[PDB]
Amino acid sequence: ATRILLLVLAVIIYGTAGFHFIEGESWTVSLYWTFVTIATVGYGDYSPSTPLGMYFTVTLIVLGIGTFFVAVERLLEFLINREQMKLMGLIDVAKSRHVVICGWSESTLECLRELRGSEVFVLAEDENVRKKVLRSGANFVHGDPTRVSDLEKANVRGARAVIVDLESDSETIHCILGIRKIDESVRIIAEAERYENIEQLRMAGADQVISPFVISGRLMSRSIDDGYEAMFVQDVLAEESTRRMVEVPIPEGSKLEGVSVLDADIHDVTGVIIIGVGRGDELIIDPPRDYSFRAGDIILGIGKPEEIERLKNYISA
């Protein structure tokens, strides 16, 4: 630790005092000679001719070599210990705008393909998960997501968003309760498995709940005969082969602040089917004709990629 610095100054005092009172040189010269001898620069312009001084250099050289080996001994121990700890997690996140993911599955792998790698930290405990996370370019933190103490290691207090996807709904509910105990304003996205636990996640404090098993079950039972709505879901929400559901905000000005939806006539002018308007953390599906657009509103619609561009320029001032 700090004992190395004390040892370095100890040998400096011994070299400077001995050379000063043996060769009769000045203090500014003895200090200069000590630094050019320990560093082994060796200018040789102030060599000690006295045989007693020669033995003083021999013991000074021995101490110089010893202080070099202890410096390497401490440096090697610090680096080996730090790399072993960092390899298996056991570290504290220092970022302040990262995204924390609790658990690891195929859905969490899908969302990494649309986000940065160094910005995402994965909090898990299994040994096999660590190798999968590393191959994806993300960061791995070793801990228990249901433990409040381990939730502070990932630094969820200053996190941009938290995504919870664990093995069971019991662990998902417990993880959300622990996050709300630390930070009451962070955004939480959670995945549900059973239909009965959808309301339990909202009571825990989840901002958005996604239930992929419920959606898949209903589509299976309704695709036995015709299954036309399963084609719409697969080709728009999953594959985006020809259509895509997008949400574009209304900027300041936007040439249409105040006009009604009927007057705008978005579908005929652009070609995008309007689903709803996002007025302040709520969705108004199929808004009435007397709805007037405002600033900062979000329009949800479905359209071709060459028609969405026709809409963004249409709402741009």
Ligand X SMILES: CCCCCCCC/C=C\CCCCCCCC(=O)O[C@H](COC(=O)CCCCCCCCCCCCCCC)COP(=O)(O)OC[C@@H](O)CO
Ligand Y SMILES: [C][C][C][C][C]N([C][C][C][C][C])([C][C][C][C][C])[C][C][C][C][C]
Q: Does 71 bind ligand X (CB under 6 A)?
A: yes
Give dist(CA 310, CA 248) in Å, integer: 12
Q: Which of residues 74-103 bind ligand X (CB under 6 A)?
A: 74-75, 78
Handedness of CA 300, 301, 305, 311 (dihedral sign): negative
SS3 260: strand
Handedness of CA 11, 14, 18, 19 (dihedral sign): positive
On whether 306 is known to bind a ligand per the annotation, the reply is no
Q: Which two tokens stand for residue 158?
A: 């200053």
The count of chain residues that interact with ligand X, using the rule CB under 6 A, is: 16
Residue closer to ligand Y by CB (options 41, 285) is: 41
> Which residues here bind K ion, judged by CB under 5 A?
40, 42
Residue 297 contacts residue 289 (beta carbons within 8 Å) = no
Best CA proximity match to 190, nearest among 210, 175, 204? 210
Amino acid residing at 141: V
Q: What angle do CA 235, 237, 242 make, to 5 degrees?
A: 40
Residue closer to a second copy by CB (options 66, 253) is: 66
Residue closer to ligand Y by CB (options 48, 64) is: 64
Best CA proximity match to 160, nearest among 97, 118, 94? 97
Q: Does 306 bind a second copy (CB under 8 A)?
A: no
Q: Does 200 bind a second copy (CB under 8 A)?
A: yes
Give dist(CA 230, CA 277) in Å, integer: 25
Q: Does 305 bind a second copy (CB under 8 A)?
A: no
On whether 240 is known to bind a ligand per the annotation, the reply is no
Q: Which of residues 238-267 bind a second copy (CB under 8 A)?
A: 238-239, 242-243, 245, 247
Interacting partner of 24 out of a second copy, ligand Y, K ion, none (Cβ under 5 to 8 A depending on kind): none
Residue closer to ligand X by CB (options 139, 146) is: 139
On whether 165 is known to bind a ligand per the annotation, the reply is yes
Beta carbon of residue 23, minimum distance to K ion (angstroms, whole number): 20
Q: Which of 1, 6, 9, 106 binds a second copy (CB under 8 A)?
A: 106
Residue 176 contacts residue 170 (beta carbons within 8 Å) = no
Give dist(CA 301, CA 253) in Å, integer: 21
Strand ranges in 6-153 using DSSP code E only, listed in sequence order: 99-102, 120-124, 139-142
Q: Which of 13, 17, 39, 88 binds ligand X (CB under 6 A)?
A: 39
Binding-residue pattern over the window 157 to 186 for a second copy, x denoting contact by CB under 8 A = ---xx-x-x--xxxx-xx--xx--x-----
SS3 148: helix
Positions in the binding site for ligand X (CB under 6 A): 1, 4, 8, 38-39, 62, 65-69, 71, 73-75, 78
- Binding positions for Ca(2+) are 165, 191, 193
- Binding positions are 165, 191, 193
